[PDB]
């Protein structure tokens, strides 16, 4: 079981971190002042060129990945037997 | 730094003004990656042009420079010559590492070379592009009025393919990596750009190959297709600067020079390839035979890997004086091109 | 077709009825282009090429419509090896809509190699994707499929963006 349990834990670990991120930012004894803050709030009711430089960098690595995959497929022994 | 590209190069209208068009040019709604761009004046110093290329834009040094000329067959070339342009030239430029100096317009030679570059990039995965560079006059550009705004490193959405008008303005081929648009302020003439082409290729043929130089001089070869009368005046302006040439078998002035090298009647030979101007162009034939060694023939020996060997034979024949310096240059160029298979079977046979 | 004596030619293949069947030879030479010859060129994969040459020769009037029909028939037969080595050699100056029509035939049917082949020969998809063509792409849906039922439920209130919203919600869902 040990392998599938480690994969399941690594997948759920994001959900546990994300639910400590969105909490009232005080300890439970003192959270009542933040529920009062929430209750009165209920009663009242990357830049553009940095994104472009990022996505062009990603597209460079995508093109290198697909070329290296194609060169590894072409130099295999079964494909070379097909061409022979 | 971005104003530095404008403060070095100037443009004349002849009232000379600092330039305003340095571009990271891209094409609208198309796959091709941003391309470099410059609008330039004529009679500029080619040293700062080259330092713009290898320091600012960023291109490696050439191991070979092959400029293609001609333009007789307008819309469609022979498929035999499309086999020559695709499987002879562009894959040799992919292997050795080379620049192709061709008119960056969509007419004549630059269209056919652009077909060969596109077809070779499709049917081959070598993880490296073919550096093709384009020179063209500023007056014939289709959308020259879009490229003004001097802000910096701007991708100008150059509208190719639009407003189809023929004969006057020509669009830019997207199969080129960098553009050198040479301006005379004429806006409609064909171009006195042949002087800048000869000065730039002479300056490239002065420099040395390698990391800190310390190598051989960069070989520059000229490839001709059928052409016109002004192409033969372009032959002579090339071969005065000690640049060898190479001839194809199709028709025109190229086959004119072939049959003239196979052997009054010569004036009759002049009276059917252009049908005009006998005695001035007969003096051009006289200067062709003053050189006699910077001209080679491709038609007798044709092949795929035969092309790079014919380039070497053109460089050996045009070397001239010393024999041992010629074989030294052939060995060090085989090292520079990173091709062991040439030097092992053509330089270490035993002769 | 390799070339009085023609009545003598009639007097040994059936040995009978000379002049009526001579009028049949007359009507054969009225057509003169719907007749092809197999004997000079024989081969295994030569047969399908000879079928194409018979269809090109009998096309007649327009040249560009003949090469358009040869390309779209090579798409319809699902044979890339014909179109690559007999239609993209370099003799034919292919235009835009000549390639866009065969690209629509290669998208509506499931021919991926023609999609890669026709995109690689210099076609711009920014001009290709007309919203009428996009409606024709989502039209070619099998009636016993899943998206046939899902696009019928999206027309109850094409409507692809509503299908993506009812699958993926507000977030994690594209627009159109
Ligand atoms: N400005 C250009 N530079 C380089 N190649 C081009 C340019 N315009 C078109 N091409 C290439 O040439 C082919 C089309 O040729 P052409 O430009 O003669 O007709 P077209 O523009 O398709 O006609 P239409 O105006 O009907 O679209 C296209 O596949 C394209 O890849």
Swiss-Prot record, chain C:
ATP 2 binds at residues 95, 122. Sino-atrial nodes (at protein level). Widely expressed. It is found in: Cell membrane; Endoplasmic reticulum; Golgi apparatus. Homotetramer. Belongs to the transient receptor (TC 1.A.4) family. LTrpC subfamily. TRPM4 sub-subfamily. The chain holds residues 315 to 519 of 1213 of the full protein. TRPM4, is a temperature-sensitive ion channel, it adopts distinct conformations at different temperatures, markedly influencing where and how ligands interact with it. Decavanadate (a positive modulator), ATP (an inhibitor) and Ca(2+) bind to different locations of TRPM4 at physiological temperatures or at lower temperatures. Calcium-activated selective cation channel that mediates membrane depolarization. While it is activated by increase in intracellular Ca(2+), it is impermeable to it. Mediates transport of monovalent cations (Na(+) > K(+) > Cs(+) > Li(+)), leading to depolarize the membrane. It thereby plays a central role in cadiomyocytes, neurons from entorhinal cortex, dorsal root and vomeronasal neurons, endocrine pancreas cells, kidney epithelial cells, cochlea hair cells etc. Phosphorylation by PKC leads to increase the sensitivity to Ca(2+). Sumoylated. Desumoylated by SENP1. Disruption phenotype: Mice have fewer dendritic cells in lymphoid organs and impaired migration of dendritic cells is seen. It comes from Mus musculus. This is Transient receptor potential cation channel subfamily M member 4. Ca(2+) 1 binds at residues 66, 69-70.
């Amino acid at each position: 079981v040990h392998g599938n349990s480690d994969l399941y834990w690594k997948a759920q670990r994001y959900s546990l971190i994300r639910e400590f991120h969105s909490r009232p930012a005080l300890a439970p004894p003192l959270i009542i002042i933040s529920h009062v803050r929430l209750l009165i709030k209920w009663l009242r009711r990357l830049s553009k060129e940095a994104e472009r430089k990022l996505l062009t960098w990603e597209s460079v690595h995508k093109e290198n990945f697909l070329l290296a995959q194609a060169r590894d497929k072409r130099d295999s022994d079964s494909e070379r037997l097909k061409r022979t | 730094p971005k104003i530095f590209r404008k403060k070095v190069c100037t443009t004349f209208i002849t009232t000379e003004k600092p330039t305003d068009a340095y571009g990271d040019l891209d094409f609208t709604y198309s796959g091709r990656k941003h391309s470099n761009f410059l609008r330039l004046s004529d009679r500029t110093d080619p040293a700062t042009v080259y330092s713009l290329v290898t320091r600012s834009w960023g291109f490696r040094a050439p191991n070979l420079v092959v400029s293609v000329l001609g333009g007789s067959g307008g819309p469609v070339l022979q498929t035999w010559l499309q086999d020559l342009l695709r499987r002879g030239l562009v894959r040799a430029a992919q292997s050795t590492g080379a620049w192709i100096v061709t008119g960056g317009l969509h007419t004549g030679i630059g269209r056919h070379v652009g077909v060969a570059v596109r077809d070779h990039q499709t049917a081959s995965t070598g993880s490296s592009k073919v550096v093709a560079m384009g020179v063209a006059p500023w007056g014939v550009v289709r959308n020259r009025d879009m490229l003004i705004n001097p802000k910096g490193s701007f991708p100008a959405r150059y509208r190719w393919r639009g407003d189809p008008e023929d004969g006057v303005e020509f669009p830019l081929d997207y199969n080129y990596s960098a553009f050198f648009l040479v301006d005379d302020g004429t806006y409609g003439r064909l171009g006195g750009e042949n002087r800048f082409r000869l000065r730039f290729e002479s300056y490239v043929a002065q420099q040395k190959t390698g990391v800190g130089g310390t190598g051989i001089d960069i070989p520059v070869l000229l490839l001709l297709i059928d052409g016109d009368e002004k192409m033969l005046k372009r032959i002579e302006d090339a071969t005065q600067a000690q640049l060898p040439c190479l001839l194809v078998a199709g028709s025109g002035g190229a086959a004119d020079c072939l049959v003239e090298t196979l052997e009054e009647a010569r004036d009759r030979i002049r009276r059917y390839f252009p049908k005009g101007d006998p005695e001035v162009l007969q003096a051009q034939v006289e200067r062709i035979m003053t050189r006699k060694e910077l001209l080679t023939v491709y038609s007798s020996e044709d092949g795929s890997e035969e092309f790079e060997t014919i380039v070497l034979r053109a460089l050996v024949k045009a070397c001239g004086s010393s024999e041992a310096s010629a074989y030294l240059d052939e060995l060090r160029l085989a090292v520079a091109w990173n091709r062991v298979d040439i030097a092992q079977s053509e330089l270490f046979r035993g002769d | 077709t390799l070339e009085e004596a023609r009545d003598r030619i009639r007097r040994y293949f059936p040995k009978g009825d000379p002049e009526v069947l001579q009028a049949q030879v007359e009507r054969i030479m009225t057509r003169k282009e719907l007749l092809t010859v197999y004997s000079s060129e024989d081969g295994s994969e030569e047969f399908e090429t000879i079928v194409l040459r018979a269809l090109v020769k009998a096309c007649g009037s327009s040249e560009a419509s003949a090469y358009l029909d040869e390309l779209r028939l090579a798409v319809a037969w699902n044979r890339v090896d014909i179109a690559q080595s007999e239609l993209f050699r370099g003799d034919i100056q292919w235009r835009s809509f000549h390639l866009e029509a065969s690209l629509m035939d290669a998208l509506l049917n499931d021919r991926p190699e023609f999609v890669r082949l026709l995109i690689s020969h210099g076609l711009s998809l920014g001009h290709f994707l007309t919203p009428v063509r996009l409606a024709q792409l989502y039209s070619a849906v099998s009636p016993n499929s899943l998206i046939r039922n899902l696009l019928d439920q999206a027309s109850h209130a094409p409507n692809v963006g509503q299908v993506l919203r009812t699958l993926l919600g507000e977030t994690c869902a594209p627009r159109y």
